[PDB]
């Protein structure tokens, strides 16, 4: 289980056709200088920690 954490730096904005997916930018919390942009399912506020099963996709906005 190579679980890596991260925490939201800036909430970009909603995406998806129904708008149920929030696009956020996260700082990796082990190395600060790495910032990847991914998208989440539930409700996210500013500065809360996430869990990344694999931190490689850097996904774009859905339609």
Partner 1 sequence: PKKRASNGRNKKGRGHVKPVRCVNCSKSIPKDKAIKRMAIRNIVEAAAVRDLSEASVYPEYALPKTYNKLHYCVSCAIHARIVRVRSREDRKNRAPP
Interface with partner 1 by CB under 8 A: which residues? 34, 36-37, 58
Closest by CA position to 9, among listed 21, 27, 31: 27
Report the residue number, 1 or 33, with the smaller CB distance to partner 1.
33
Nearest distance from residue 28's CB to partner 1, in Å? Answer: 12
Nearest distance from residue 25's CB to partner 1, in Å? Answer: 11
Report the residue number, 42 or 56, with the smaller CB distance to partner 1.
56
């Amino acid at each position: 289980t190579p679980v890596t954490l991260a925490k939201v730096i800036k909430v970009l904005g909603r995406t998806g056709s129904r708008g149920g997916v929030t696009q956020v930018r996260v700082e990796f919390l082990e190395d600060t200088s790495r910032t990847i942009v991914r998208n989440v399912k539930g409700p996210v506020r500013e500065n809360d920690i996430l869990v990344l099963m694999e931190s490689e996709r850097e996904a774009r906005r859905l339609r």
